[PDB]
Design a protein around this ligand. Structure first.
Ligand SMILES: Nc1nc2c(ncn2[C@@H]2O[C@H](COP(=O)(O)OP(=O)(O)O)[C@@H](O)[C@H]2O)c(=O)[nH]1
Ligand SMILES: [Mg+2]
Length: 311
């Protein structure tokens, strides 16, 4: 596929894996961040030589923000093999999920702005600012069958749910038949934790495409403690309100129920009471396991009923 070597702290590893896969990479190797980073190469020189020459690794991904000197030196070595740091990784995730011209322009504006300090540390500078100025110009100027979008935080199992329904391009829109009805399933970008300031506008503009969909499926990790559940739901419904989602039916799926080892009904009833406190209209709240294929027919049937309600 696209294979990545990923450098990440233990604290972020789980999260960064799910991010790398949202950027359509397979993680084929994982290393901690270097204790004592290399002034030139950030990662160790011998490691960089191995990755340089390993035709099974297409891309180096470092879950941190790299200095311009690191980019210059890494890109030199890799010789056409790609390096993403954390900002460029998330811009890649956005680029793969964005279908609108406005989002595409914000992503490109961010990527241009991020290259500037790299070029400055290396006329080209002038070429880049003219494009940056043009896009900013055009952005300030633009400012003046049923579709169900899948939303939720990273690692909640949005891709697992989509794959499971589809039986599986960018952006990912995939029509499926349920009974006698055709339904368009839309992979929206996730809610993302810890978004670097530089890319917040590209993030929100990409996410705000969720308002194109007739209805939404909101995916929530059931393994979360009760107070983490409350917070996740408060923040999901916070964000949806602020991007201008209003009156769209929302089907909430409490996922990963297989991994709960614990009280599913109390979790379910908490999620249901709270989601209905925070938002209207809630279509329904159901428990599933997208991995273990638990309650998939329930999910199926509820997507069909919701599609019947929309039509
Ligand atoms: N145990 C369990 N794991 C799941 C389930 N759904 C997804 N996952 C896993 O959790 C991680 C996040 O899943 P993914 O579908 O990519 O989440 P996303 O970042 O929101 O798209 C992946 O390792 C999935 O295999 C589930 O129902 N149960
Ligand atoms: Mg995913």
């Amino acid at each position: 596929m696209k294979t990545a070597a990923l450098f990440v702290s233990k604290e972020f590893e789980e999260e960064a894996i799910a991010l790398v896969e949202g950027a359509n990479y397979k993680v084929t190797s994982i290393y901690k961040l270097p204790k004592s980073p290399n002034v030139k190469f950030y990662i160790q020189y011998d490691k960089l030589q191995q990755i340089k020459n390993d035709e099974e690794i297409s891309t180096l991904i470092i879950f941190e923000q790299l200095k311009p000197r690191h980019f210059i030196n890494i890109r030199r070595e890799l010789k056409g093999k790609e390096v993403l740091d954390k900002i460029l990784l998330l811009l890649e995730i956005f680029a793969l999920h964005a279908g609108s011209k406005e989002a595409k322009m914000q992503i490109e504006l961010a990527r241009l702005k991020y290259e500037l300090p790299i070029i400055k540390e290396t006329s080209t500078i002038k070429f880049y600012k003219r494009r940056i100025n043009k896009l900013m110009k055009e952005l300030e100027s633009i400012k003046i069958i049923p579709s169900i979008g899948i939303v939720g935080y990273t690692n909640s199992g949005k891709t697992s749910l989509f794959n499971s329904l589809t039986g599986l391009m960018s952006p990912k829109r995939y029509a499926i038949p349920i009974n006698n009805r055709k339904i368009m399933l839309v992979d929206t970008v996730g809610f993302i934790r810890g978004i670097p300031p530089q890319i917040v506008d590209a993030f929100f503009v990409t996410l705000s495409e969720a308002k194109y969909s007739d209805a939404l499926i909101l995916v929530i990790d059931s393994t979360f403690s009760e107070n983490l559940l409350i917070e996740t739901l408060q923040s999901s419904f916070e964000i949806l309100r602020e991007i201008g989602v209003s009156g769209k039916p929302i089907l909430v799926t409490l996922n990963k129920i297989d991994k709960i080892n614990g009280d599913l009904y109390k979790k379910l009833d908490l999620v249901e009471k709270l989601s209905k406190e925070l938002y209207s209209p809630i279509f329904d709240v159901i428990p599933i396991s997208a991995l273990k294929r638990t309650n998939l027919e329930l999910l199926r049937d509820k997507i069909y009923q919701l599609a019947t309600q929309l039509s």
